[PDB]
Amino acid sequence: QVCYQAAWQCLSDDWD
Amino acid sequence: ATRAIPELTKLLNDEDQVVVNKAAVMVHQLSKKEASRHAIMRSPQMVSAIVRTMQNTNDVETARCTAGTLHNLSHHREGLLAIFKSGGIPALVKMLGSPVDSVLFYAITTLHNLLLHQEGAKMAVRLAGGLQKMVALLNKTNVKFLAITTDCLQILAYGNQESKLIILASGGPQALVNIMRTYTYEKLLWTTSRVLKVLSVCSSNKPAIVEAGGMQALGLHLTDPSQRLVQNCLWTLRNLSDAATKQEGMEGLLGTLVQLLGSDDINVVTCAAGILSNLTCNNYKNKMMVCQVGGIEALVRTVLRAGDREDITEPAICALRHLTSRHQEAEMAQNAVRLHYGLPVVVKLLHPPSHWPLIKATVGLIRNLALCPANHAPLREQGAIPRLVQLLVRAHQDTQRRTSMGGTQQQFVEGVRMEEIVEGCTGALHILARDVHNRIVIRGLNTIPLFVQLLYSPIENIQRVAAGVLCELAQDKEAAEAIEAEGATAPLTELLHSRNEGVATYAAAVLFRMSE
Amino acid sequence: ETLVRPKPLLLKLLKSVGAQKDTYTMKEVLFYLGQYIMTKRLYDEKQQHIVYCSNDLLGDLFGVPSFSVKEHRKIYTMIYRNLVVV
Ligand SMILES: *CC(=O)Nc1ccc(NC(=O)C*)cc1
């Protein structure tokens, strides 16, 4: 599930 | 001269209040001729009797004859002395609470003259409570009366915290703001803006002006022909912009500020950029609104026109930073920078002779532009990646020489902390690594060891961005090898339980790629 | 900080995974939305950046049955649509 959370974290990085 | 003066002096002092009436009237007519007013001036007894009767009578006609008498008296250097040394300033300040317009005009005009030409008058008016009385009068309507009252405040407040704090405590800010909304008389507006500029320097007054709505009110007058009014409004606006970025009703001010970026005057450009920077800092709605009126296009043209003038580029780049992240139109703003030919000039602001603040702001802007996939290749083709590595290397190796084992000697260079440069540069390279060609360029610069070093950094967000960029690199097999060889396995594992859960996410992502 | 107030549509799906308040930061909205997708396990395990939400509420709140996690601007657009900034 690491591959998915890492993709979701790239998503959320746009709001940093 | 001294013929009827003693007997008139002896009639203002009289226990019959009718007698002091016809006294005061004929002393008024008397005060109108240079020969007859000279003498009243040279008579210390006559002057305090006027002042004493003005201040104590309850009848109206005498109260404005005496007040008019002192006003006639105040046109001469030696009439200002006689009024001063007879305790007239406390008396004039008392009459500012009178409900009669005639007396009010005489009292505020005599005070205005004393404040302008009589030394010691500033202090005396302050002791008597003149500021509080003057602020209270600012709710009057007569345009000319307001201009005299506000100029008196200008005189008393200039370079005097006590007077400014008193004007603050007396409710001055909202009254001065309401004058700027309501009136169009230039001379009153200019004078009022002078007081607001003086108050805006004192950071304690800023919230009161903002809250009253001074930003929108001062913005009303940036189209005014009088340019001394405009730059006074602009100066005050810039001073006030860091306080409250949470204000509504700013559509017109923001649109006008974008238009002012194209001003022939170069200090108007500088102020407009600095205001827009502060107003866009934290504000979702201001961001949507600046973009909607073409702010990105104007700010890019502002940067091109500025060249090496960092008083312009630094705020303009900061404004462009804010507008390219964390709002609905950020994806447009990122493209608009490229489509209006901003990418090349943004990259050379990274090189010398820019100073650290502009470099920090430019790095943050590049990180935001990299969020747009259409910017990945053009930023690469402009040489952004090696320059970001240059700044990252110089900033990291600067932190190291100050870290030992007592921590790192925290310091600032040109107002910036090198740790910020490490953070933004690696963050910028983090977003840029989303593209395969960029990853080849990044590793090609022998950066994998540098990023592995940054994992041990005690800053939280530096672990964030270091683990993040190593992640993106690892999704290429021949990369993934090189990172394990440097020794990333151990620290990445202890990062798996970080208060910053995002750090654990990349950390596990790297570990999956390396040894599968 | 930007505080948002999600539309009732999106507010179910947040409280579907234990959300409390009616206003949030984008970080929290992105966390719960992320937690949701990993609980429902709507992602394909062959390529775990694809998310089919065919007959799940997510598709009903977003529009279309199957986005990718990496199409960032399409997801944020759909996110913004269900939000009101404060
Ligand atoms: C298996 C895997 O590693 N998937 C993955 C990792 C990272 C990213 N990063 C971004 O999308 C920014 C995507 C997918």
Author numbering:
A (entry chain C): 6 to 21
B (entry chain A): 149 to 664
C (entry chain B): 25 to 110
Would you copy out the relevant sentences from the publication that reported this structure?
We screened MDM2-based focused libraries against β-catenin, a key component of the canonical Wnt signaling pathway that is often dysregulated in cancer. Finally, we performed x-ray crystallography to characterize the MDM2-β-catenin complexes induced by trimerizers H329 and H330 from C91 and H332 and H333 from C92. The calculated electron density maps indicated that residues 6–21 of H330 and residues 5–21 of H332 were well-resolved. Gratifyingly, all four structures confirmed Helicon-mediated ternary complex formation, with the Helicons bridging the p53-binding site of MDM2 and the C-terminal ICAT-binding site of β-catenin. The interactions between H330 and β-catenin include a series of intramolecular hydrogen bonds, including between Arg582 of β-catenin and Asp19 of H330, between Arg612 of β-catenin and Asp18 of H330, and between His578 of β-catenin and Asp18 of H330. Interestingly, Asp19 of H330 also directly interacts with His96 of MDM2, serving as a bridge for the assembly of the ternary complex. Finally, we observed engagement of H330 with the main chain carbonyl group of MDM2 Val109 and the sidechain of β-catenin Lys433. H330 could also promote the interaction between MDM2 and the full-length β-catenin. Meanwhile, by SPR, we found that H330, but not H332, could weakly interact with β-catenin in the absence of MDM2, while both Helicons could promote the interaction between MDM2 and immobilized β-catenin, but with different affinities.
Here, we report a general and rapid method for discovering α-helically constrained (Helicon) polypeptides that cooperatively induce the interaction between two target proteins without relying on previously known binders or an intrinsic affinity between the proteins. We show that Helicons are capable of binding every major class of E3 ubiquitin ligases, which are of great biological and therapeutic interest but remain largely intractable to targeting by small molecules. In addition to possessing increased stability and membrane permeability, Helicons are capable of binding large, flat protein surfaces that are inaccessible to targeting by small molecules, and Helicons have been developed to target a range of PPI targets in cells and in vivo. Characterizing Helicon-E3 co-structures and mechanisms of action, we identified new binding sites for α-helices on the E3 surfaces, as well as potential probes of the disease-linked E3, WWP123,24, highlighting the generality of our approach against this therapeutically important target class.
